[PDB]
Design an enzyme around this catalytic site. Sequence first.
Site, PDB file in Angstrom:
ATOM      1  N   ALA B  65       0.811  -1.211   0.000  1.00 45.83           N
ATOM      2  CA  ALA B  65       0.000   0.000   0.000  1.00 45.83           C
ATOM      3  C   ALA B  65       0.848   1.265   0.000  1.00 45.83           C
ATOM      4  CB  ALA B  65      -0.943  -0.001   1.210  1.00 45.83           C
ATOM      5  N   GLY B 110      -2.765  -2.389  -2.304  1.00 43.83           N
ATOM      6  CA  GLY B 110      -2.636  -3.470  -3.266  1.00 43.83           C
ATOM      7  C   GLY B 110      -2.509  -4.836  -2.629  1.00 43.83           C
ATOM      8  N   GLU B 113      -6.201  -5.577  -1.692  1.00 41.11           N
ATOM      9  CA  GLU B 113      -6.831  -5.851  -2.979  1.00 41.11           C
ATOM     10  C   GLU B 113      -6.570  -7.281  -3.430  1.00 41.11           C
ATOM     11  OE1 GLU B 113      -5.150  -2.491  -5.016  1.00 41.11           O
ATOM     12  OE2 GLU B 113      -7.136  -1.661  -5.451  1.00 41.11           O
ATOM     13  N   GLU B 133      -4.937   4.701  -0.122  1.00 43.41           N
ATOM     14  CA  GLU B 133      -4.920   5.171  -1.509  1.00 43.41           C
ATOM     15  C   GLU B 133      -5.064   6.679  -1.700  1.00 43.41           C
ATOM     16  OE1 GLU B 133      -4.552   2.477  -3.588  1.00 43.41           O
ATOM     17  OE2 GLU B 133      -5.259   0.828  -2.328  1.00 43.41           O
TER      18      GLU B 133
END
Lengths: 243, 243, 246
Positions: B65, B110, B113, B133
């Site tokens: 991230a 990420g 995710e 983000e």
Amino acid sequence: HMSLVTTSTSDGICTVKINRPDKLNAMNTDVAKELIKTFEELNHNDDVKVIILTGEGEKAFSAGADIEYMSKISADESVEYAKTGQLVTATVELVKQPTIAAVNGFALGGGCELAMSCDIRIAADTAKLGQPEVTIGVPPGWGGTQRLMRIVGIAKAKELVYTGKMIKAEEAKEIGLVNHVVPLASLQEEALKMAQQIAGNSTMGVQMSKVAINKGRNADLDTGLGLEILAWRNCFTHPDRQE
Amino acid sequence: HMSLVTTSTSDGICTVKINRPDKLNAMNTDVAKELIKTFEELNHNDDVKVIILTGEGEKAFSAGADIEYMSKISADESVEYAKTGQLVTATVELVKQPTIAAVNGFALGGGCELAMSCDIRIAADTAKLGQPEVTIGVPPGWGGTQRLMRIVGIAKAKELVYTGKMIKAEEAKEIGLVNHVVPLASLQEEALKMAQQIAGNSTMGVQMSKVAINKGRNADLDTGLGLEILAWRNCFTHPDRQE
Amino acid sequence: HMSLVTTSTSDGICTVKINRPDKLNAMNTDVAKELIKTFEELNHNDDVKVIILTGEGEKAFSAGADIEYMSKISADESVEYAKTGQLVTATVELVKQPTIAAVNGFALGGGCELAMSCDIRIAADTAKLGQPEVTIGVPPGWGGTQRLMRIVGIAKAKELVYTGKMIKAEEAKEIGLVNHVVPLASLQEEALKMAQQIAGNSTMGVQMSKVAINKGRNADLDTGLGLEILAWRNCFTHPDRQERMT
């Protein structure tokens, strides 16, 4: 094979009970064919306001996983096997009057899967819900591959189908499988309680919202708004609003 | 940056580890393309029947991230970075065999995710799931603005991304971001225990359900009912129906 | 019939306050058009960063279900009322700036549909979140049927629409259509604290998430990745990509 009674103030509430307590309220082609004509294929009469459905015998809703095992036939007829199952749930799903589901104990395989076809689920505290199916060798095919996706989200959808286990009614309430919980000794009184509240409202306002809510789910948000207005004005052509 | 192990019953558990205990198992271009090699481009070995994944070291499942950003050039080059991350998440989402996201602590950006692409996710009490983000200056690119919306619903992704906070384990299960918040440490002891239950049922009742469930996540109910019948009928022409 | 009152750190936080305490901020066509013709300017004012929309004191948001009830036109201007009602609830949803509703008390009818059109909704335990539309004949025309379903779920959306009951907003937190809980002294602190939590982040990052969240929900995932990638790129040609990754 089944029983039904109608009773309310001015006779506007009717209940449908699956009558097979000797076989754990199991469902077969014979029973599923009668339930299709019970709801009259997407249009009931004028008398009833809102329907209730549940299982008789006090034990289970429909435990069609421990006693219901007959599929040793050609795979061709599986198309018709998994098309009368969709016929009954869709008739349950889109019947003209609303139905409040009343889970009474166990509901597994198709009985729970039939419960997902309704609007409001009033649960008994001794319920044991799940979608076993897979442990036999076949996935759910009575409609449940897209109901758990639509009710409890997808995070909980991939759980109960992959496993085939059972979870408590409290856990079912937590994820949204059953909307509300009532004690087993206060089910055949509180199931009507919601219905005795539901009946004293507009006769057309409820079912008009049913069409406006059961048709916009397949489309997007934008197109549903155009669909919404068609039902909004459909109320104004009926004098229930005016009084 | 990967390892394969199969120590289990039924010889079918292939948990995937990220061998970067010095950078919290973060995500970049180097590791991302190797995940496809592990998941063999939408294919996997027959012997493996179910899969889980986690982060090595029991410190972070995947923390790609804020510790491992590398995008400060060529806005036309950051279309492959999202498309590679799109490829890795799409690959993991639709694997032949089911997944279990065993988050051992950190899972953000990420990395979360990657955890969001799983079907079944079992969490940890020390989890720090979140999508900063926007604090970095990016709108989630590897499905963060889609996967999070279809999992926790629409009303609880508009706060995780707008504010970009690190929610803890207790408030991660509270909405449905993670199916279960069972032990951080027995995630190995219980997810394999959970997996051995998954693999204790028929395989074709599991992966053919995955095809029906995954495809119908955004289609209409009737078409989704069309998806299930063939997959339901696919499980009628195999030795996994009678015996 | 409202006030802006915008202040923040380098003032960018908007708290639009509906002003009609006499009839519990009734939701008629005038206020169903007043809020459009300022949020458009708010849509066209880039200085303001966060938006809040609510009442003014201690009673309730808006009771546009049983207070103002004008249903008499011969079914032909009711379509215009639906078209006017839909339009007022489509600008708040798609306004450029993040919307934290922070509902305050009675949200039944127009207030409830308007509240759910916002992105982030705080709700009380004393607040009333329910739709009494059906009991008087009409369904919720301003988007109650299909905004309640998407947010919480179709299983629980029908129950509130069908019974028309006023569930306590504490249940709504468990139900899932609202966000956060804290005891009733000051909505002006925590709701505007989280506004700073939004105002402290990149201006275009949320918007490229906002105009990517509000679109990809409807269509399938593959199509949704379209807006998903076409919005990730837009936050890169802007300088804010290279000023915060430092």
